[PDB]
């Protein structure tokens, strides 16, 4: 698995890509990218539902966690901030790519 | 949305079914089933990834949360118990249906 991390003013984007199909046992072994815990997180990538849930939990200490849905934007699934669950963060792919990508 | 809740000795199964396609705004409004917080939770159902992540977060206070995958069983995605992330709980549909279904 490969991560691409983009640090924006108010959130960090964590994009993952699965290069080979994965077994659940690797969740123990995944090295998750460190982030500024003072900003929320948007998680994006194609993978099994349990991988998204695992990643969303790993970032639960941040102000909010949102999960990217290509038909909506990033849906807030947990928040300890002004955002409510079910709110949407409108991420535009051409705007996010103006930021630096950190490859972990 | 409809929930079916099955209380087993060591975990509670929370199955959901979406009767009409849903907007993210309803996560605020969802009445989630109460469970014995002394047992972990297995979450099952067909729905958007953000709905699974939302439900997994709502049950994070229990000893563990697992997400059902029809090809594997229930994959542990968070745990504060003897289970490790990535472990699998082997649920057999004909055994779980021996239990009482609580409809919320």
How does this model look, in words?
The structure is a homodimer of 104-residue chains. Chain A has 104 residues and is mainly beta. Chain A has one domain. In chain A, 13% of the residues lie in helices and 35% in strands. Chain A has helices at residues 49-58, 93-96; strands at 2-7, 11-17, 40-44, 64-69, 73-79, 88-89, 101-103. Chain A has a seven-stranded mixed beta sheet, with helices on one face. At the A-B interface, helix 1, strand 4 and strand 5 of A face helix 1, strand 4 and strand 5 of B. Chains A, B: Pfam families: Cas_csx3. Chains A, B: This is CRISPR-associated protein, Csx3 family. Chains A, B: InterPro entries: CRISPR-assoc_prot_Crn3/Csx3. It is classed as rna binding protein.
- Helical content of chain A stands at 10-25%
Strand content of chain A: 25-35%
Q: Tell me the count of domains of chain A.
A: 1
**Gross morphology of chain A:** globular
Q: Alpha-carbon distance between the termini of chain A?
A: 10 Å
How many runs of DSSP E, i.e. beta strands of chain A? 7
Count the helices of chain A. How many? 2
Radius of gyration of chain A: 13 Å
What structural class should be given to the helix and strand makeup of chain A?
mainly beta
Largest interface: A-B, 29 and 29 residues
Largest sheet of chain A: 7 strands, mixed
Quaternary structure state of the chains depicted? homodimer
Placed side by side, the strands forming the largest sheet of chain A appear as 6-5-4-3-2-1-7
Order of helices and strands of chain A: EEEHEEEHE
InterPro entries (chains A, B): CRISPR-assoc_prot_Crn3/Csx3 (IPR013409)
Protein name (chains A, B): CRISPR-associated protein, Csx3 family
Organism (chains A, B): Archaeoglobus fulgidus DSM 8774
